[PDB]
Amino acid sequence: IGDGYEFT
Amino acid sequence: IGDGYEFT
Amino acid sequence: MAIYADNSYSIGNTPLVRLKHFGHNGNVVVKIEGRNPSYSVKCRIGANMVWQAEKDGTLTKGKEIVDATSGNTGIALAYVAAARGYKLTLTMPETMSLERKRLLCGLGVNLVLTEGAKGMKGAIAKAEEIVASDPSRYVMLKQFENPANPQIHRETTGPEIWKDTDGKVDVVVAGVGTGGSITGISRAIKLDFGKQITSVAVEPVESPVISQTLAGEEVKPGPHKIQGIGAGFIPKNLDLSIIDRVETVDSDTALATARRLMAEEGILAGISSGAAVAAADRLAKLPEFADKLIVVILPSASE
Amino acid sequence: MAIYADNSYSIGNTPLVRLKHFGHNGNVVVKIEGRNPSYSVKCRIGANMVWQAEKDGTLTKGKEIVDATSGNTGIALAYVAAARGYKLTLTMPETMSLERKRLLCGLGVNLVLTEGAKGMKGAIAKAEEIVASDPSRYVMLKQFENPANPQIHRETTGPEIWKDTDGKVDVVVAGVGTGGSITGISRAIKLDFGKQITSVAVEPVESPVISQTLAGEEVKPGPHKIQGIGAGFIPKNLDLSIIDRVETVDSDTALATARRLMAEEGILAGISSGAAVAAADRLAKLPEFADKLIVVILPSASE
């Protein structure tokens, strides 16, 4: 998991 | 241990 | 004789360490999942998802694996694909780390990079297209909804915690990405062992979707820096019904907490470990929790 | 109840994994030391060197640690210094990795960088100066000659290998940096358990000083790329008298072997793990070793 939808 | 004396 | 037939079988039996500079008189103990192949908790699910797909016959000799993860699940699947002789394709949005790229190529992954702008939506999209083109060929494991994810935690992570604490664990605190960790652990201690503990999920303040959901408020996701958690929706692998409490933590505090674990405890933990510890610290310093043994999952190592 | 009072106590109990694409019919098994705090075998000696210095009273509250390592021993000491509340200064030759730099600063190490050109000689020099200026203040642990280095391997690494193989280990192959690993392991199985195994040291072909020594030839060190081994002299912590055999391996083959472990076994090993496996492979494919259980130390994870 980096984005499920949103990470920065 | 990187160098004991010499590594590159 | 204790020799594993491949790396996949070496998962788990990770250690419990008491914290010295958090909690109150050593009531916070951490479980270091960085002590695993691929160096994260995802090693457990990468192995069980492949193992179950084998047992039920969705995965055979001939069939390739495809999936969309831009985090530790890629690395986990990569090592397992390698250990067991499967080809693996991973999709992810091109604005990924050369380091992550390089590591995955090293592990022999086929990389299909998607447009930066379009993010995980892009990568998920492109993964499904790739399955769609040859259904008999590719199998997608789907970490968000595959019950082999929480199941492994019920069979390993939970029991380890119970065994190593001689049944004394009172609280378990865990960041939520897929929800698999907190779900499996909770089911194991509550249902299998019969002890009514407090199960605490943790999410970024920037994207507090579990909190908004349970409060029956508008779900409002956002960007954050706590890699591993804060998916911006509720995964199917999060069993809300076993969650006793939800703690939110901000990016800056999660980072700082990480840096503190390094500097003060000599514990090399990732940002989400920082978030998990910040939450645990907070409960450990309420009188209601003062005499309670609290166990925190540290999902990964540094970065 | 199995809860460690600090990270230092969590060392070891690392796993045995059978290799599938090396040796002959699974006669090569690897011990993954990357599964440790600080992610290397040096976690064992970092802990025991501090622990022994405490027990004998050379290290107390008030006393700082200084030493010159440019490898995993720095990281090991850093985590232990942090876990147990000691200040640490490390010296090293400025042409070090920002990544290594950053990681050590993160762990709260005082960094004193020495001239590039002057290498380890420079760094060792400057370390001794720093002790010389305040002898009652600083203590140097000296990984090359401190008997708490091999001792831990005799008390942990060796026994683990014996226990996990139900006494069946026939051969142990280990790269040599300080010599502590092969020494302690060998003493344990030969002397403590009573089994006459074959102890195999491994060194770069570029700098084959153990080989030249035992053959009574001119000792001729050189540069190589196999980080962790090939010190370019015989350390005091290498007990030559327990070494049955010496295998040399080149940089290119050690790197390639590393890349193979990644791609083929899903094992994330460093270059010196590559060198160790190349040597083991070679013996495992001699008929004299075909029916022999061979155990190889994998010192670190990737890079």
Per DSSP, the residues of C27-73 read -EEEEETTSSGGGBTHHHHHHHHHHHHHHTTSS-TT-EEEE--SSHH
Beta pairing partners, C173: C200, C296
Specify the pairing of strand D3-4 against strand C16-18. Answer: parallel
Q: What is the C-alpha separation between D121 and D133, in angstroms, rounded?
A: 19
Given CATH 3.40.50.1100, say whether it is the number of domain D43-139: yes
Q: What is the DSSP letter of D20?
A: S
Say if CB C154 and CB C190 are below 8 A apart: no
Touch test C–B: 3 Cβ pairs or more under 8 Å: no
SS3 content of chain D, % helix, strand, coil (to 5): 40, 15, 40
Question: Does the annotation list D186 as a binding residue?
Answer: no
d(CA D186, CA D171): 10
Q: Which helix (H) or strand (E) holds C119?
A: helix C119-132
CA–CA min distance D217, chain C (Å): 40
How far is the first Cα of chain A from the last one, in angstroms, to the nearest whole number?
A: 12
| Neighbouring-strand partners of residue C246 | C201
The answer for C259, left when phi > 0, alpha when psi is -120 to 50, beta otherwise, is alpha
After which residues does chain B become discontinuous at a C–N distance over 2.5 Å?
Answer: none
Could you tell me the two tokens for D190? 């030969």
Q: Please give the method by which this entry was determined.
A: X-ray
CA distance D177 to D42: 11
Kindly tell me the sign of the dihedral angle through the C-alpha atoms of D88, D89, D92, D96.
Answer: positive
Q: How far apart are the first and last CA of chain D?
A: 36
Contact A7/C230, CB-based, under 8 Å?
Answer: yes
Bridge partners of D54, per DSSP, are none
- Which of D187, D194, D175 shows the shortest CA–CA distance to D147? D187
CA distances D294 to D98, D173, D284, Å, are 37, 7, 7
Give the distance from residue D93's alpha carbon to the nearest chain B alpha carbon, in angstroms.
Answer: 9
Q: How far is B3 from chain D (nearest CA, A)?
A: 6
Give the resolution value in Å. 2.1
Domain boundaries, chain D: 7-40+147-298, 43-139
Cβ-based contacts of C81 with chain D (< 8 Å): 266
Can you say whether the dihedral through the CA atoms of D264, D269, D274, D277 is positive or negative? negative
Q: The dihedral of CA C302, C115, C47, C4: what is its sign?
A: negative
Q: Kindly report the CA angle at D31 between C80 and D55, in degrees rounded to 5?
A: 130
Kindly determine whether residue C73 and residue A7, on different chains, have CB atoms separated by under 8 Å: no
Which CATH topology does D7-40+147-298 take? Rossmann fold (3.40.50)
C-beta separation of A4 from C119 below 8 A? no
Q: Which CATH number fits domain C7-41+147-298: 3.40.50.720, 3.90.1150.10, 2.10.69.10, 3.40.50.1100?
A: 3.40.50.1100
C21 touches chain D (CB under 8 A): no
How far is D170 from D130, CA to CA, in rounded Å? 45
Identify the active-site residue in D31, D40, D42, D251.
D42
SS3 C248: strand
Distance in angstroms (rounded) separating the CA atoms of residues D121 and D68: 9
Phi, psi of C96 (to 5 degrees): -100, 165
The reply to whether C93 touches chain A by the CB within 8 Å rule is yes
Flag if C225 and A8 touch (Cβ within 8 Å). Answer: yes
Nearest CA among D62, D64, D69 for reference residue D42: D69
Does chain B touch chain A (at least 3 C-beta pairs within 8 Å)?
Answer: no
List active site positions of C: 42, 272
Q: End-to-end CA distance of chain B, in Å?
A: 12
Q: Which of D272, D273, D292, D300 is catalytic?
A: D272
Give dist(CA C14, CA C35) in Å, integer.
Answer: 6
C272 among the known binding-site residues?
yes
Parallel, antiparallel or unpaired: strands D28-32 and D16-18? antiparallel
